Design a binder for this molecule. Sequence first.
Ligand SMILES: [N-]=[N+]=NCCCCn1c(Br)nc2c(N)ncnc21
Ligand SMILES: [N-]=[N+]=NCCCCn1c(Br)nc2c(N)ncnc21
Ligand SMILES: [N-]=[N+]=NCCCCn1c(Br)nc2c(N)ncnc21
Ligand SMILES: [N-]=[N+]=NCCCCn1c(Br)nc2c(N)ncnc21
Lengths: 261, 261, 261, 261
Amino acid sequence: MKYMITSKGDEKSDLLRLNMIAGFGEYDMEYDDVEPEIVISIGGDGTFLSAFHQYEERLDEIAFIGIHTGHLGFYADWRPAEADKLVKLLAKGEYQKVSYPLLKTTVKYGKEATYLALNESTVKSSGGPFVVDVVINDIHFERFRGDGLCMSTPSGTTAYNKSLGGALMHPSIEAMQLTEMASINNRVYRTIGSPLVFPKHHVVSLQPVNDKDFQISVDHLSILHRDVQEIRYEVSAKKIHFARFRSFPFWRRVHDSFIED
Amino acid sequence: MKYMITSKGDEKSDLLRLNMIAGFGEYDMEYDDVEPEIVISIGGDGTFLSAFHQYEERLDEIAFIGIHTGHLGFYADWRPAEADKLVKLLAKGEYQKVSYPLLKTTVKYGKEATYLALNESTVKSSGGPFVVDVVINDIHFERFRGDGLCMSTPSGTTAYNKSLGGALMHPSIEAMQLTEMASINNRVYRTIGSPLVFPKHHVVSLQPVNDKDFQISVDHLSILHRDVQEIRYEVSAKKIHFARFRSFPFWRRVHDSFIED
Amino acid sequence: MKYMITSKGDEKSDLLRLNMIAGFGEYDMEYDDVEPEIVISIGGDGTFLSAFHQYEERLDEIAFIGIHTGHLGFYADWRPAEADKLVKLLAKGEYQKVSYPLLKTTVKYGKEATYLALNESTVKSSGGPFVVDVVINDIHFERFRGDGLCMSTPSGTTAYNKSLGGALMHPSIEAMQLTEMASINNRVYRTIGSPLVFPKHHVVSLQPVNDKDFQISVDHLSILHRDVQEIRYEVSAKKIHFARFRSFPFWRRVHDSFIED
Amino acid sequence: MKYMITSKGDEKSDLLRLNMIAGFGEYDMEYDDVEPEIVISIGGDGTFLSAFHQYEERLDEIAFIGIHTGHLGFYADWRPAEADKLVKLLAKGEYQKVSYPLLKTTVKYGKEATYLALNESTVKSSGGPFVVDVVINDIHFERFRGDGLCMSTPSGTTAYNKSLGGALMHPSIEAMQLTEMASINNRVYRTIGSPLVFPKHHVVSLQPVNDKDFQISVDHLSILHRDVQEIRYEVSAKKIHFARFRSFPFWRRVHDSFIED
Ligand SMILES: [N-]=[N+]=NCCCCn1c(Br)nc2c(N)ncnc21
Ligand SMILES: [N-]=[N+]=NCCCCn1c(Br)nc2c(N)ncnc21
Ligand SMILES: [N-]=[N+]=NCCCCn1c(Br)nc2c(N)ncnc21
Ligand SMILES: [N-]=[N+]=NCCCCn1c(Br)nc2c(N)ncnc21
C-alpha cells in the first residue's frame, strides 16, 4: 500500500521516520504523501492533528497511526520501541480498523464554510462581550453570556473539554459535548451550566445577538470570522479510521495520562 | 387494556385519579394494578419513581405515563389539563412508545443482589472514610477517596448527577455516567475528577479497600449493605417504555425546568 | 463641596443628571469635574468603573456614589427614586464614608507600568499557549498552563471572579483572590485548581516561560503588553471611598443580584 | 515549663515520643498532661486535631507543635529528623508564637451547645432531604437544598473545604468560609453556588424548614443532634497558638502537599 510519515521536526522524530522508511523499503510499500492508505504521525497529539487535517479530504481511504516520541498521547499512543514491529504488521496488512466520531462545524455569512474537528471547535468573542442564543433542534435553549463555548468530540473530551469541567466520553459513543467558558449567571441572565451531550443528528446552533464577529477555532486552527450569521454543530457523518495493532483501552489511556504511569 | 393509576396521596392527585378512572370507565379499559399494560403516575417525578420500581419486574409489558400536579417533572411531564385527552388516546391505543436506558447495579457478598435504577445509584461510606478501588473492564482505574460516587442513567443526569457537576445526556444514548462526591486530591492521592461516560457492555466495578460496609442507594431507596465485596455498574439490558402522546423534547424539558418557564 | 456627575449617555441617565445638577444648584455646591470631592455615576457598574479610573489619581479626596438606572449594581446600588434625597444629604455633608481594598498590578519590561483595579486584573496569552510560573512571596508555587489567571479585589469577587468558580469575599477583608481559567492538569502538569486568597503585603508574581507577550486586562481596559518580564499582584495601599447614606449590606446586595428580587 | 506528648499509637510515633521525653529529661522540663504549656503531637494532622480538642479549654496557655511521622501535614509539619532540635529550642523557651483563627459553632434546642473547630464544621441531614434557610446577619440570604453545608476555618480551607471547591485562605486572615455540598438548582430553587468568605463578627445562621434533626460534625467528631432550632457560625474570639521554631510558609506548605515534593 501507499504510505507517508509526518514528523514533529525535531531530531529523534526525523530519525525515527527515516528508520521506518528504510524498514518499509524491505517490503511491498511505496512512499506517497498524495494518495496514501496509511498515515503515520511521529511526535505528539499535535503532530497527529496536523496529519489528520492534512488528509481530511480522504478519511475513508486512510488508516491513521500515531507514535509519541515524548509523553503519551491519546492519538500518538504507541511507543517508539514498537516502531520496528509496527512496520512489519503494517506491511502484512490484514489488521483491524477502529473509527472515531468527528465534529461538523458550519458557519453562515450574509456564504457557507464547513469544517471537521478531531478534538473540538470553540467560539469566543472578537474583543467585545460574547453573547449568543443557543438553539437546539430549532428550539431556543438559552442565551449564553460569558467567555465562549466549546463543542467537543468524544476523543476530544480529554483535551480542552476536560479543562472546562466537561465529562470524558468513550469514543465509541457517536455524540458531541458542549461546555461553557466562564458563564455569567445572575438573577436576570441564566445558563444551564452543566455540560450537554448530544447524540447523532442533533443540531446545535449558535446565533448572534449583537456583534457578528467571532473567534472560531477548530482543533489547532483558529480564524476570525466576520459578519457571522449562524454556527451549526452536529456529529459528522465522516469518521477517522485508526490502524489497530495491539490492545490499548481508552480508559487505560486515560489512566496513564492523568492518574499514574 | 388493563391499567392502574398511582397518586401522590394529596387531595388534587387523588381527585384527578378518580376522574381518569371515571373517564376510563367510558371505554374498553379494565382497572388492574397486578397485570397492567398502562401505568399512570399522578404527582411528581418521585411518584413516578415509585410506580417504576413497583412494576420493575414487568417493564417490557407496560407503557408508563406521568402527570405532574405540581411543578414540571422530567418523567411526570404532562399537565393535568391534558388528563381528559390522555384518557381518550390511551383508550384508542395505537400510540408510539419511547424507551430509556436503565442502570444495573450488582452487589456481591461473602451472595449477590441486583437492582435496577431509573435515575442513579450512589455509594457512600457507613460512617467511616470512603475508600474504594475503581475497576473499569477488569483494569484498575483509580483509588477513589472522598464522600462517594454516583452512577447515573441518561435521564437521571438531570437529577443528583447534575448537582455533582455531571453532564446532561440525551436519553437516546445508551450509556451511564459516573460522578465524584468531594474527592480528596493531594500529591499522593489522585482521582480523575472529570465525570465519566460509559457505553453499553462497559462494566464499572467498585472494590473495597478497608471497610466493607457501604450505604448504597438506588433511586429513592437507600439500604446499608454489610460485608460488601464488589459493586458492579453497567447499562441494563432492560428498558423503560413511555407512552408517547405528543411532542415534548428532552432539551425543551431541560429548558423549562432550569432556564425559564 | 465641588462635585461632578458622569452618565451612561442614554436618555434617562442624562435627564437624571441634569435634575440632580438643578437640585444641587439650590445648595452650596459648585460643579467641577477637575477637582471634585464627590463623584456621582449614573447608569451601571460599568459607568461607575469609568468614573473610578477617571479619578484614580485622587482617591483619598473623593467619596463615590453610584446610581443604577437599570438593574441593580454592586457599585451603582441606589435607585433613581432616591436621587432627590441623595442630593440633600450630600449637600449637608456630615455623612460617613466606607472604604474598599484595591488591586495593585505591576508590569516590568526590559521599564515599569503600575495599575489600579476596582474589580480584577486578568492575564491571557497573545495568541499562543499561556504558560507562566507563579511565584508567591519569592517562592515558586506552580507552573500554570491554561487560558489565564484572574486576580480579583474583594468587591470584584462578584464579577469575573464569580464566573471562574471563585469565592465571594466581604469587601471589609483587605485581601485579593486568584482564580484559574481552564487549567490543564495531567500526570506531568499540575495546578492547585482551588482559588487562592492572599492577605495584605503578600506579593503574587507571574513570570514568563516562553512568550513574553500577554493580554493584560485591568477592569474594563485591556492592553497587549510586549516583552513582559514580570507581573506583580498585591493589595493596594490606596482605597476607594464611598459616601454611605443608608444601609445596604453587601450580602443583601449579593442576595438581590443572584438569588431573588 | 510543663509539657506533654500525644502519639498516633503506632510503633515509630511511640518511640519518637519516648525519645523526646528522654531528651526533655536533660532539661528543666516537667512532664504534665493536665496543665501543660507545650503540647506536641506525633503522627499526622488527625493526631494533632485530637490534641487540640483535648486541650481546647486552655488554648491561651499552650503552644502547639506537630510532628509528622508519615506524609507532610498542615499542622504536623515538622520532620522527625528535627525532633532532637525541637527539644532543645523548646527547652530554652524564648520562641515566637503564631495564632490561627477558629470556628465557633452554636446549636440551639427547645438548650444551647457551643463548639470550637480547627478545620471546619459540617451540617448534613439525618436521613431525609437537607433543607435549611441561610440567615446572614439576621437577613435571610437563601434557602439551601442539597447534601449539606461546610463552614471552614482559614487553616481548614486545605481540608474538606478544598474538596468542595472552596478557596484556600491564608490563616492570617481572621475569617470563615462557607461551601455547598451538591446543591440542587432549578428554576424554582436557587442557591448562590459560589463559596462565601465572612469576616469577624459576621454571624451565619442555619434555620430548619422541616426536619429538625441534623448530622452536625466538628473536625473529626460527628454527632446527631435532634430537635435543632438554630445553628450559628461565627469566627471565634479564641485562637490556637503554635510554637514557631523555623520558617515554613503556608503557601510553601500548600505547594509541598498538592503540587510536588
Ligand atoms: N486546554 N487544553 N488542552 C490542550 C491539550 C493538547 C494535547 N492534546 C491534543 Br493536541 N489532543 C488531545 C486529546 N484528544 N486529549 C488530550 N490531550 C490532547
Ligand atoms: N440532588 N438532587 N436532586 C433530586 C431531584 C429530585 C427530583 N427528580 C427526580 Br425524583 N427524578 C429527576 C430527574 N430525572 N431529573 C430531575 N429531577 C428529578
Ligand atoms: N464575566 N463577567 N462578569 C462581568 C460583570 C459586569 C458587571 N459588573 C461590574 Br462592571 N462590576 C461588577 C461587580 N463588582 N460585581 C458584579 N458585577 C459587576
Ligand atoms: N475531605 N477531606 N479531607 C480530609 C483531610 C484530612 C487531613 N487533614 C486534616 Br485532619 N486537617 C487538614 C488540613 N487542615 N488541611 C489538609 N488536610 C488536612
